[PDB]
Amino acid sequence: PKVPPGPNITATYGDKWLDAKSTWYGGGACGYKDVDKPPFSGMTGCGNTPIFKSGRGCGSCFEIKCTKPEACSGEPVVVHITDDNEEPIAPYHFDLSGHAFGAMAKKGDEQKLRSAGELELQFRRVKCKYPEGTKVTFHVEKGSNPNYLALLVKYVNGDGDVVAVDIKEKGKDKWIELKESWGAIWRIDTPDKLTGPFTVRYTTEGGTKTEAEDVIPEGWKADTSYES
Numbered sequence: 001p002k003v004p005p006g007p008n009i010t011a012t013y014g015d016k017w018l019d020a021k022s023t024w025y026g027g028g029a030c031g032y033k034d035v036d037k038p039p040f041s042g043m044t045g046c047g048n049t050p051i052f053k054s055g056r057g058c059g060s061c062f063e064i065k066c067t068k069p070e071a072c073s074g075e076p077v078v079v080h081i082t083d084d085n086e087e088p089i090a091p092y093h094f095d096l097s098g099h100a101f102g103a104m105a106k107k108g109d110e111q112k113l114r115s116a117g118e119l120e121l122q123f124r125r126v127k128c129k130y131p132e133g134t135k136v137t138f139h140v141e142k143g144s145n146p147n148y149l150a151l152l153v154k155y156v157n158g159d160g161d162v163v164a165v166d167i168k169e170k171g172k173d174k175w176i177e178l179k180e181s182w183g184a185i186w187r188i189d190t191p192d193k194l195t196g197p198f199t200v201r202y203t204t205e206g207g208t209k210t211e212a213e214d215v216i217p218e219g220w221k222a223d224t225s226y227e228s
């Protein structure tokens with residue numbers, strides 16, 4: 001096979017560090033619920049427009065390091081973007097949670113640092129790392145009836161943002177294309193009842209179409225999460 005081929009020449013997120021202002025806080029736009037519990041575990045933060053990207057960036061994970069105040073470890077920590085930072089104060093502005101903010105400090109200085117209020121950090125997008133056992137969850141948003149479906153596609157550790165979500169009822173052969181809306185909520189209204197079990201197929205930025213067969217059961221209920 002000759003000599004090992006170097007990395008595939010494909011479009012990708014950088015690998016260089018970007019600069020952003022950072023502050024913290026102690027029902028987000030992305031619709032995530034128990035953020036203190038796994039897989040996020042408090043490692044979350046509000047991200048402004050170029051990070052949130054109207055919702056497309058809800059699963060987003062970023063490495064964030066800090067060298068500014070003395071308490072900063074200079075070591076990187078991964079944060080999951082769970083909301084929208086409507087009031088940015090710099091080109092890039094991360095509004096991290098208290099836990100996340102402090103997580104950039106030297107062992108035991110998490111509070112000393114959290115007292116800094118604002119600081120300058122460096123960040124770069126990275127593939128999320130969820131604890132094993134974590135499965136891509138599809139949440140049927142409330143307001144869904146048998147003629148309207150609106151769902152979230154959580155924990156897709158994929159490469160990029162999911163850019164399309166389709167469903168197929170166990171029995172038919174045509175794909176129903178969902179429309180993207182703010183908060184990464186895919187929606188579809190139809191004349192035909194949305195009864196039978198649906199297979200959800202979501203494709204990521206790359207082009208990688210992955211399917212979750214019959215994940216949404218017949219007789220599903222609004223505001224309920226079903227996993228694969």
Ligand SMILES: *[C@@H]1O[C@H](CO)[C@@H](O)[C@H](O)[C@H]1NC(C)=O
Binds near residue numbers: 005006007008
């Ligand atoms: C390059 O792309 C192919 C097809 O997706 C994949 O199987 C292969 O492992 C990739 N190579 C590297 C070095 O990542």
